[PDB]
A paper describes a structure:
The spike (S) protein of HKU1 plays a crucial role in cell invasion by binding to host receptors, with the transmembrane serine protease TMPRSS2 recently identified as its protein receptor. S1 comprises four domains: N-terminal lectin-like domain (NTD), RBD, subdomain 1 (SD1), and subdomain 2 (SD2). S2 includes the fusion peptide (FP), the heptad repeat regions 1 (HR1), the central helix (CH), the connector domain (CD), the heptad repeat regions 2 (HR2), the transmembrane domain (TM), and the C-tail domain (CT).
To unravel the mechanism underlying the interaction between the S protein of HKU1-B and the host cell receptor TMPRSS2, we elucidated the cryo-EM structures of the HKU1-B S protein incubated with TMPRSS2 in various conformations, including a closed conformation, two 1up conformations (designated as 1up-1 and 1up-2), two 2up conformations (with or without TMPRSS2 bound, referred to as 2up-TMR and 2up-1), and a 3up conformation with TMPRSS2 bound (referred to as 3up-TMR). Both 1up-1 and 1up-2 conformations contain an RBD in “up” position but with different rotation angles.
Residue numbers in the entry:
A (entry chain C): 646 to 794
B (entry chain A): 795 to 1221
C (entry chain C): 1043 to 1221
D (entry chain C): 299 to 397
E (entry chain A): 51 to 298
Amino acid sequence: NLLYDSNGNIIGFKDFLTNKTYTILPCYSGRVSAAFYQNSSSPALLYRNLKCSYVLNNISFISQPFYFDSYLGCVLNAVNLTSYSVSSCDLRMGSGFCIDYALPSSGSASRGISSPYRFVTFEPFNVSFVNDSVETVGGLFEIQIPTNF
Amino acid sequence: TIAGHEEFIQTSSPKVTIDCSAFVCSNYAACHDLLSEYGTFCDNINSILNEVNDLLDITQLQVANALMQGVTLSSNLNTNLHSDVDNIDFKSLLGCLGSQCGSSSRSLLEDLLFNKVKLSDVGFVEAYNNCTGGSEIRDLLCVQSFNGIKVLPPILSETQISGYTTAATVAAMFPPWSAAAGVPFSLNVQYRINGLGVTMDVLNKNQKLIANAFNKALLSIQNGFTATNSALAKIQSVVNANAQALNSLLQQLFNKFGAISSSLQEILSRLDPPEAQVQIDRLINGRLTALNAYVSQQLSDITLIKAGASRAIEKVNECVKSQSPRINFCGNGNHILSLVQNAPYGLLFIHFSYKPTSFKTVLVSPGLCLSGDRGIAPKQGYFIKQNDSWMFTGSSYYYPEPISDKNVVFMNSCSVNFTKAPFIYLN
Amino acid sequence: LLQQLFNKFGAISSSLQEILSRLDPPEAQVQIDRLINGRLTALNAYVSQQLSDITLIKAGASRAIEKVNECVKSQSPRINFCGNGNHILSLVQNAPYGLLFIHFSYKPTSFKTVLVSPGLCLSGDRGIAPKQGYFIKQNDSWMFTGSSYYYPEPISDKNVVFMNSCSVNFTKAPFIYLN
Amino acid sequence: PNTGVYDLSGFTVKPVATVYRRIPNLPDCDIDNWLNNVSVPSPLNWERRIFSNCNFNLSTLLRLVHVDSFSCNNLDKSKIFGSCFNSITVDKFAIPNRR
Amino acid sequence: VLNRVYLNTTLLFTGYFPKSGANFRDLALKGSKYLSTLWYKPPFLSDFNNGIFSKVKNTKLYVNNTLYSEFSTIVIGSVFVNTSYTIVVQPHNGILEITACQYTMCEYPHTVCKSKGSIRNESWHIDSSEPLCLFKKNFTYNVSADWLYFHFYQERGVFYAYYADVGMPTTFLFSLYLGTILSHYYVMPLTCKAISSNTDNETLEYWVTPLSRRQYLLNFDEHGVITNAVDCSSSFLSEIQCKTQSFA
Ligand SMILES: *[C@@H]1O[C@H](CO)[C@@H](O[C@@H]2O[C@H](CO)[C@@H](O)[C@H](O)[C@H]2NC(C)=O)[C@H](O)[C@H]1NC(C)=O
Ligand SMILES: *[C@@H]1O[C@H](CO)[C@@H](O[C@@H]2O[C@H](CO)[C@@H](O)[C@H](O)[C@H]2NC(C)=O)[C@H](O)[C@H]1NC(C)=O
Ligand SMILES: *[C@@H]1O[C@H](CO)[C@@H](O[C@@H]2O[C@H](CO)[C@@H](O)[C@H](O)[C@H]2NC(C)=O)[C@H](O)[C@H]1NC(C)=O
Ligand SMILES: *[C@@H]1O[C@H](CO)[C@@H](O[C@@H]2O[C@H](CO)[C@@H](O)[C@H](O)[C@H]2NC(C)=O)[C@H](O)[C@H]1NC(C)=O
Ligand SMILES: *[C@@H]1O[C@H](CO)[C@@H](O)[C@H](O)[C@H]1NC(C)=O
Ligand SMILES: *[C@@H]1O[C@H](CO)[C@@H](O)[C@H](O)[C@H]1NC(C)=O
Ligand SMILES: *[C@@H]1O[C@H](CO)[C@@H](O)[C@H](O)[C@H]1NC(C)=O
Ligand SMILES: *[C@@H]1O[C@H](CO)[C@@H](O)[C@H](O)[C@H]1NC(C)=O
Ligand SMILES: *[C@@H]1O[C@H](CO)[C@@H](O)[C@H](O)[C@H]1NC(C)=O
Ligand SMILES: *[C@@H]1O[C@H](CO)[C@@H](O)[C@H](O)[C@H]1NC(C)=O
Ligand SMILES: *[C@@H]1O[C@H](CO)[C@@H](O)[C@H](O)[C@H]1NC(C)=O
Ligand SMILES: *[C@@H]1O[C@H](CO)[C@@H](O)[C@H](O)[C@H]1NC(C)=O
Ligand SMILES: *[C@@H]1O[C@H](CO)[C@@H](O)[C@H](O)[C@H]1NC(C)=O
Ligand SMILES: *[C@@H]1O[C@H](CO)[C@@H](O)[C@H](O)[C@H]1NC(C)=O
Ligand SMILES: *[C@@H]1O[C@H](CO)[C@@H](O)[C@H](O)[C@H]1NC(C)=O
Ligand SMILES: *[C@@H]1O[C@H](CO)[C@@H](O)[C@H](O)[C@H]1NC(C)=O
């Protein structure tokens, strides 16, 4: 009537009353990541590898107006701005993503109620670019030579 | 002909993070109350692992800085159009670059390497996404992460590292030539071959054989990751070592350490609070000991990984982006050049080299004493006697040529075991 | 490390003064043993951390000895070892727990667009290659320029390397017999 | 506190309900009828009964026999109350006075 | 194992097992008329220390194209008198009758094949008074089976019995508290008329090996059947197999 594994746990059973067979799985367990910038009233929160549907239905029932889904997991209390790129980051969330902080200023105080945390792209290194060709132009190559130093 | 071989150097490893009180005392409140009177034991373990992961991120940015230092690309560069220079096909080496592709790909050599390795950096993320259900029933990674053991992603994704190596490989091919000494790729090949003792007439007349030997070695590199490649065994040893360490750490939650049971559920359903404490204490001590030993081992392995990363940075600087006058540094002697590709937890270098095939036995002299009691010695070659005339040949290809001042180094005197050759006042 | 003298390690107190003023010698040993084991474990962990940091220190010190020997006291023909490329020289200063290296580098400011050639095919089907620089066409005549400063100048025997053949994509120029 | 990324302590999803299963209409163990049987054995030929597939409680068992002392070992008394076991073996004998 | 199922896995399990590389011993005896007294001697009257494992042949006699199953009965005990309890396992052509009573056992006992009866009468006890019995039960086995397998052991005053008629791994039959220690067993001679080589060429077989508590590595397949086992202390290959918890 009981199904075991080699470590000694019960992983399934068959009911004495109904002759129905079931398996057992454990309940979900995990932690939260908090990206916190100094002199703020709250952190931004990341639920790693979780959907926001699961987060709002099975984890927390408290008030959270801002939430979205990212490749890293569910982000609460931050703004989805991953079209904008940043080269120096002190809240680096993993796999190329950053949390930026920008409080609304005196004159740059947008009246729409948002979060000062943004979820942006981390990209530290770059190439230099030139506006010259990649092939021969009449046999000769186009190149950029210094004239002063 | 031109030979080629590949070599994997390991620059990182999976970043393990550990929830200490979740590992020791998973959900049970009496265990947590007992663990509170051990002081700062769990905070120290967390701090050591965070220091290790900071070191891993520093070395990752150093590798990425070596790949991108001083490279200037044309903004007209579009690798859906530009994948061939001088009859050498670099199509399987480049990912995507250009303002009309969207940098969201690997090269196919990277794809062959990254599909035989299941638990890469993106494999961990997409495996942990399936842990609300197991996606069939169950998985070992979900059991580990419910017991407080997770692998964190690195701070740069692997498509960014692939973009770095793509820009490095394409800086050698195209008219700024920031990685091929400011001269084109075939010209740089001919100069590095000519610097071994091979004359430039042979290399001007055998240009297509050089290109075809390059393409042949590249295609045999690509069709070679098949179950006996040593660099693939090098790559998979990293993943198997990480999996064995984490599974043997998870097996510590089923030792009794001298208690009556290895389960807190069983002790808390059979005993009283003054009697369950003595049994819970032994499980606490054994699990904290196992965590301490794991933390010491990770601390000693990060030093090996940093030594390997510094060697890989030196190879990118002095083998891939330039070519040193050091002999037997990259490759083995008769080394021509190197390329780099992104591998799981490291880099993969391709070394091209000169390879002789057939031979001829020559009688040679190292020096000629001319009349006036002067001397000449050959400049990377030997002196030979052909048809009773003295001639020069390079040391790595048999090709006689007239003795001129570009083959010799003069001396106002001459050595005693030079051969006397008074007939010589030639060109 | 000093904070470990206030952990209890599962005993009744973290002070030996309190334990030795409340208990008998047989009963106090059980409490003292937990403190002794926890403190020795904390010391062993500190020693492991120091053993691991001295390896990174030795690797960095060997890199500093290399840079003193081959960037300050002489200059090696390696590129990208000291500095970044376009590197000129280094000086060294003493810093707390290390050395401070000052690297000087050739930094270009303004640039120019030129059309260059990588090698010429002279009559007799001989070939010349430019020595660290390019062949440019100035006033419809071939000249040499170095790669890191634009300065046209005559094609001579000190700007080239000579070949008795010429490569297939080289530029044909019969009008050169010059010095 | 300083600017940083902080990993906070662990949550578990809280259990909504209880599933509770028992077998209905099982016999009574009648441990009191054998404990209060008339013929009492000596310690030399002590007696054993096995009780399985039944229903018991310790309240009626401890108020139907006249208890001097009820100690337990490797178990706690309050852990018996909602429990199920595979069997219960009950040995009984009379106690000599000096022993 | 008792009410557990294991599925596609290896398991390290300590139990009451035989020793890999030891010997069986065919203790079956057949007679027609005479009974030698050396048939009842300590070569054949063996020891029951922790238990026995035994492999039994089901001899299939035929009368009128109708099957008859037959093998030898076993008796377990300590002194085999009517002041101590003895266990008797006796087959009755598809019915296995197992009794634990205070028997008054005969000095030279035997049984008789019932399909083609023998010269003598079946005589292993004489008791018209129906003695005290701790246990009395009837089990049914597969008549068409070739091999039957039996585990018999003791532990802390309790006697345990496992059996199989389909396949080699056994399943639990019964347990019985005794409070004493059993110390001998004996397989009885089955006296028959037509079993030998001048008749239909049949044979009695009853092979016994001792049992002890030891650790095996077991292999459970997808339906939960034991398919392979290895004794962890029989060779060097088995040590590699148990320390790696692998069969290859
Ligand atoms: C579950 O399966 C068991 C099989 O063991 C069923 O028990 C059988 O019930 C029928 C009719 O009630 C009897 O004829 C059999 O003798 C029983 N078997 C045994 C071994 O006792 C049981 O009825 C099933 N339950 C349900 C709800 O279907
Ligand atoms: C108390 O125990 C004795 C045995 O020690 C019980 O006697 C049994 O009684 C039944 C009839 O009810 C007989 O069939 C048994 O054979 C008796 N056994 C013995 C060994 O004599 C007695 O019944 C018990 N008392 C009660 C109230 O049940
Ligand atoms: C505890 O056990 C006693 C028996 O020792 C149970 O008492 C029986 O209760 C049922 C109905 O509740 C009666 O029909 C029986 O006659 C009772 N027997 C005796 C000997 O008193 C009692 O029910 C049990 N407790 C609970 C909560 O069920
Ligand atoms: C087990 O089955 C056997 C065979 O069916 C039963 O043995 C027979 O029992 C009847 C009734 O007492 C006797 O008349 C026969 O002589 C017995 N046969 C033999 C060959 O001796 C036996 O009674 C059954 N056991 C139980 C406990 O019911
Ligand atoms: C911001 O934090 C700093 C801590 O370095 C503190 O000194 C300062 O007063 C804070 N500013 C405000 C406006 O709270
Ligand atoms: C965040 O913004 C990007 C770009 O605007 C978009 O592609 C992405 O879908 C957004 N995220 C969500 C959850 O909508
Ligand atoms: C390239 O990266 C650097 C990093 O400092 C950044 O400043 C620069 O703006 C980037 N280039 C472009 C075109 O965005
Ligand atoms: C520079 O590039 C832009 C497009 O990026 C192009 O329109 C322009 O003509 C280029 N300038 C020169 C001088 O070639
Ligand atoms: C180079 O720059 C310096 C400083 O700006 C200036 O004085 C000088 O005239 C420049 N030379 C040329 C050739 O442009
Ligand atoms: C020479 O250049 C042409 C383009 O001008 C190219 O098609 C050809 O492949 C080149 N050949 C070699 C050997 O470089
Ligand atoms: C996760 O599960 C989905 C469906 O359940 C499956 O398609 C996908 O391949 C799984 N991925 C991993 C890494 O297990
Ligand atoms: C058999 O066991 C292996 C263990 O690696 C497992 O992968 C496989 O799914 C199992 N087969 C079945 C039918 O359960
Ligand atoms: C077998 O068959 C014969 C002939 O029909 C009959 O005489 C005999 O009694 C049968 N045997 C038994 C045991 O009934
Ligand atoms: C066996 O018993 C029966 C009836 O008691 C009797 O007829 C027969 O002669 C007996 N056989 C022997 C050998 O005593
Ligand atoms: C066991 O019994 C069943 C049905 O009685 C039969 O199909 C099977 O063949 C028997 N086993 C053997 C080994 O004959
Ligand atoms: C028994 O075996 C012998 C082999 O020597 C054979 O000759 C005889 O016919 C067999 N008889 C039967 C009934 O199988």
